[PDB]
Design a protein around this nucleic acid. Structure first.
Ligand code: IHP
Ligand code: MG
Ligand code: MG
Ligand code: MG
Ligand code: MG
Ligand code: ZN
Ligand code: ZN
Ligand code: ZN
Lengths: 193, 50, 145, 292, 261
RNA sequence: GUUCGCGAAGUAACCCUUCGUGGACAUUUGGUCAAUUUGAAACAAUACAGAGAUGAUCAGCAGUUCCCCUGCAUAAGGAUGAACCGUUUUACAAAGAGAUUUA
């Protein structure tokens, strides 16, 4: 609904939450169809969420055994950087990704004592807590991030945008204050007219 | 008429203040009384020095 | 609300769109209440919007810490026994469903089928007799005053 | 000021008869119909069990500048529309008073933020300046196409037959209809005469009037009604050749009738506007020939 | 009464027989928020209404009659109301009793309950303005309505006189052939508002005609609000009635000051 | 419907059933909102143009505006985002000459 309210009907959002354009885009369409970090980050959370929920669907349908299920979730929560590509939009999540990799190294070598290299290890609890704590940090963030986005949809941009001084516009703003100060002092000197 | 004024329980998902948009409004000036610009009169002789 | 083509959904489309800021919270309450490997199915208590906008899972997962530690430990042994004596273990492919197909509805597909066998250690009736009845409940000893 | 705002201006007849009314205030509800700028939408119901919500459509600034209520937008005193209010003051001061409204969205918002009154809102909301003009209303009450070939059509209009009892017809030919006198007023006068009121349910009579040709015809079903239409008309005019014509009698007007003795249909009066004007010009002589 | 209060209202359209809520496809992808088609060139996007109001047939008692509803069913006028006798709004042509109930309410909104606007829509279509008590309809688009029959210049006026007479009391009907359009003026504004939505996108085919199977292929006739009448033969009639309206109000207004004193 | 009474009839023997009749319990939902053309999204396509200093070729950063767009944004980008590049007459007098009036 958000994509189609913006008029971006040529972007197809599939059921696995990949966002692909359906056609070659003109430059005016490419500028309009640029979606921010808050949109994509919201999408990547759902892509991570659906990827978990689909495995519980696979278990319940009977395609997947419970040992495969527990290994499946443990495969998800360790490989979210590879499976989803959340990092691109919030690169702080590499702390959680390198933490889940580090827990994967600890868990496997206590698990695979006297066992061969093989896929099945379903102790997903350590990796589970890392994501829940990452979700805890980004709940106040995205609510601010999307809450500005949705109000920009309903109300529009404020017309009172005041640009702060920055490194790029410091030299121009230094000149505006300098021409004003010289203008004021000379105009007092002037007797009249 | 004595009229009780109550507030409606807002839906937390629907946008509160549905009439609030980011629009631009130009304001008229309310000029009822003129302000007298009260200088003094006129040391007004001046050559071409300025 | 699968196909909101009608004019009647103009307010309910706004309710979908305004619920997007709360969606992040709804992912947390879903994932924190996820069924552990010893449970077939978990009945959670949900709070939903009347236009079907968002569905928060209105619970917090409380566990008894020595019970919880035993429950992972039992599944930890049960998976080490499993990986030892499997001829071949087939890890499932990801993503499990193709992107073109919609998520299949709960009731036409999931609700009718028998669930499956959850991960359980086999147990010793002489060694584990105090816990063997209630160790794998959804909330263990919940009704025991 | 967003924390100091006026109370809303609503009529007594919008609020109705009951004493206590539960009204709902929404601090930035809808936007105003006039200035297109948001306001506090008040809405309420007359009784508890009613079925119509009465909303405030305009803001209090647009309601003050016109001196109208926010709900029905009638004037707060005299309870009349704004277009009729500014016309009644125009007959007293002998000059046009008028509230003019911008079509421009930047000039709808501009015109509301000024603290003036518009139109007759200086006269109204001053009770002394309103009652004396009502007194000045009272003295006013003390005063209290020659090239057209029309000959194909006038053969079909009767124009030479008499309004007697003896022909039994369904249709009649009404001429001498002014450019005033609306089509509903002639059907109501005939149905008042026969007592066949609520005629549009049963479709007892069907009437066609051109208003350019100043002529028309009315068709009856069930020809026995035709003798009731003949016998319930008393006054007739006899042309000094003969050929008596009945008069329908709309207030201050006179409409002549002759039994058509066939169904006239549409287009009997004319098939072009330029052509129909000459039939009224054709008739005006025959009316003067009938009377004088 | 005999035609209306005697029976109950009947279901005009079955709820399965209702049209699809998506429009006819004029684009490449369907837009979900704005229920329209997006990547499309253009379209006339106007079509003949498949339904019509038989006034003496479909009228009857409804739920809103017992409830004291003031407003008329918009779909009843389109010939589309699927609720029938269970519907909250009224199902009959407006009468002097009905409009007297609407007298406090008609000033700001139509007989269907929809709120009127400050100025008219640009093409003079739509709901209408509360600044002008317009009672005259502009009947346009007659060529696509007749499915391109020639018929006459003035047999066109016969069909317009036939249909709109069922929808209430008429002040006058004027047809203009050179402009190919009609001007229907009603006794009440409420009938004009009712007949406007009744006769939008309709056809004048009269079944007996040979095109009655192809009534659907055509365009449909625009019923729009009418402008002021430019001849001074009508202009002087306006200030005459505006005079008479003013005299009838002053008598009502001095009685208010009589009670005020 | 429940419960407390009272009365009548029947079975009874002060209980059960029946229907008469007091009580008590419970007390005013929802709508700013109607289901396709006529109360309003926008793109794309077609035709015609075709990127600021300048001699040519390249970076820009601003300002003003009742223009905004994308963006979480007070960051940044949008051709240096665009629009600017036109039109242009009185706070007006003081001196010094030849034609034309006036009466
Ligand atoms: O490829 P390497 O870097 O040499 O290490 C691999 C790799 O783990 P890491 O990438 O974390 O090191 C495998 O995981 P993937 O790269 O395929 O995701 C992992 O197996 P999994 O695929 O099941 O995680 C495997 O260990 P094992 O086969 O015991 O699970 C482990 O090599 P080791 O045998 O040295 O652990
Ligand atoms: Mg820039
Ligand atoms: Mg450049
Ligand atoms: Mg650039
Ligand atoms: Mg710029
Ligand atoms: Zn206003
Ligand atoms: Zn009012
Ligand atoms: Zn209905």
């Amino acid at each position: 609904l958000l994509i189609h309210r913006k008029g971006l009907t040529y972007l197809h959002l599939d059921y696995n939450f990949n966002l692909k354009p359906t056609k070659t885009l003109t430059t005016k369409e490419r500028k309009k169809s640029r979606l921010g970090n808050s949109f994509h980050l919201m999408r990547e959370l759902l892509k991570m969420m659906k990827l978990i929920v689909d495995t519980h669907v696979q278990f319940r349908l009977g395609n997947v055994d419970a040992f495969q299920l527990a290994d499946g979730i443990h495969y998800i929560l360790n490989h979210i950087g590879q499976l989803t590509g959340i990092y691109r939009y919030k690169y702080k999540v590499m702390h959680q990704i390198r933490a889940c990799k580090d827990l994967k190294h600890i868990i496997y070598y206590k698990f695979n004592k006297n066992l061969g290299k093989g896929p099945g290890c379903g102790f997903w609890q350590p990796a589970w807590r890392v994501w829940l704590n990452f979700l805890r940090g980004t709940i106040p963030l995205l609510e601010r991030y999307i809450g500005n986005l949705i109000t920009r949809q309903f109300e529009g941009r404020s017309n009172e945008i005041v640009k702060t001084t920055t490194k790029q516009r410091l030299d121009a703003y230094y000149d505006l204050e300098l021409r004003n100060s010289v203008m004021d002092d000379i105009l007092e000197m002037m007797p009249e007219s | 008429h004595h009229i009780e004024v109550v507030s409606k329980q807002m839906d937390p998902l629907l946008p509160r203040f549905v009439g609030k948009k980011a629009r631009k409004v130009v304001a008229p000036t309310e000029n009822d009384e003129v302000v007298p610009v009260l200088h003094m009169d006129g040391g007004e002789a001046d050559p071409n020095e300025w | 609300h699968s196909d909101m083509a009608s004019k009647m959904y103009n307010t309910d489309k706004k309710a979908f769109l305004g619920a997007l800021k709360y969606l992040p919270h709804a992912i947390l309450k879903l994932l924190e209440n996820m069924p552990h490997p010893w449970e077939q199915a978990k009945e959670v208590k949900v709070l939903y919007h009347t236009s079907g906008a968002i569905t928060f899972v209105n619970e917090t997962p409380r566990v008894i810490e020595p019970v919880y530690t035993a429950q992972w430990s039992a599944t930890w042994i049960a998976m080490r026994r499993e990986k030892r004596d499997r001829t071949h273990f087939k890890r499932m492919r990801f993503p499990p469903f193709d992107d073109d197909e919609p998520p299949l509805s709960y009731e036409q597909h999931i609700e009718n089928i028998e669930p499956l066998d959850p991960i359980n250690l086999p147990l010793d009736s002489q060694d584990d007799e105090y816990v063997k009845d209630w160790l794998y409940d959804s909330r263990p000893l919940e009704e025991d005053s | 000021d967003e924390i100091n705002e006026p109370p809303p201006n609503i009529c007594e007849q919008c609020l109705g008869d009951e004493a206590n009314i539960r009204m709902t205030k929404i601090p930035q509800g809808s936007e105003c119909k006039i200035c297109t700028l948001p306001f506090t939408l008040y809405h309420f119901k007359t009784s508890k069990r009613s079925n119509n919500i009465i909303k405030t459509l305009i803001c209090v600034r647009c309601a003050t500048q016109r001196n109208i209520c926010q709900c029905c937008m009638l004037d707060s005193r005299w309870h009349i529309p704004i277009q009729l209010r500014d016309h009644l003051i125009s007959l007293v001061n002998e000059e046009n008073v008028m509230t003019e409204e911008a079509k421009n969205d930047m000039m709808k918002r501009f015109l509301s933020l000024k603290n003036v009154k518009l139109g007759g809102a200086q006269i109204t909301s001053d009770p002394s300046e309103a009652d004396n003009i009502v007194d000045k209303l009272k003295n006013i009450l003390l005063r209290a196409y020659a090239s057209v070939d029309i000959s194909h059509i006038l053969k079909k209009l009767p124009l030479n037959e008499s309004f007697l009892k003896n022909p039994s017809t369904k249709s009649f030919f009404l001429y001498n209809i002014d450019a005033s006198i609306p089509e509903w007023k002639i059907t109501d006068t005939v149905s008042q005469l026969l007592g066949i009121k609520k005629w549009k349910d049963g479709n007892s009579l069907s009437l066609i009037v051109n208003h350019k040709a100043k002529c028309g015809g009315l068709r009856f079903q069930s020809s026995e009604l035709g003798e009731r239409f003949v016998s319930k008309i008393s006054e007739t005019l006899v042309t000094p050749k003969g050929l008596k014509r009945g008069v329908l009698l709309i207030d201050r007007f006179r409409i002549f009738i002759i039994p058509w003795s066939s169904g006239f249909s549409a287009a009997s009066f004319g098939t072009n506007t330029a052509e129909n004007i000459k039939l009224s010009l054709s008739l005006n002589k025959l009316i003067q020939l009938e009377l004088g | 009464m005999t035609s209306w209060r005697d029976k109950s209202a009947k279901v005009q359209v079955k709820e399965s027989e209702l049209p699809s809520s998506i429009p006819a496809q004029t684009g490449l992808t369907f837009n979900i928020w704005y229920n329209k088609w997006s990547q499309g060139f253009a379209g006339n996007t106007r079509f003949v209404s498949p339904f019509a109001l038989q006034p003496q047939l479909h009228s009857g008692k409804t739920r809103g009659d017992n409830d004291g509803q003031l407003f008329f069913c918009l779909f009843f006028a389109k010939g589309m109301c699927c609720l029938g006798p269970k519907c909250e709004y009224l199902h009959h042509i407006p009468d002097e009793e009905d409009i007297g109930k609407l007298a406090l309410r008609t000033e700001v909104l139509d007989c269907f309950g929809r709120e009127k606007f400050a100025d008219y829509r640009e093409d003079m279509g739509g709901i209408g303005s509360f600044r002008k008590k317009n009672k005259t309809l502009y009947v346009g688009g007659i060529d696509g309505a007749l499915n391109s029959k020639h018929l006459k210049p003035a047999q066109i006026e016969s069909r317009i006189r036939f249909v709109f007479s069922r929808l209430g009391d008429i002040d006058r009907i004027r047809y203009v052939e050179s402009k190919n359009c009609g001007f229907v003026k009603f006794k009440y504004q409420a009938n004009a508002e009712f007949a406007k939505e009744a006769m939008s996108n309709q056809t004048l085919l009269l079944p007996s005609d040979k095109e009655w199977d192809d009534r659907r292929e055509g365009t449909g006739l625009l019923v729009k609000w009418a402008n002021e009448d430019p001849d001074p033969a009508a202009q002087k009639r306006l200030q005459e009635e505006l005079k008479l309206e003013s005299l009838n109000m002053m008598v009502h207004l001095i009685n208010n000051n009589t009670n005020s004193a």
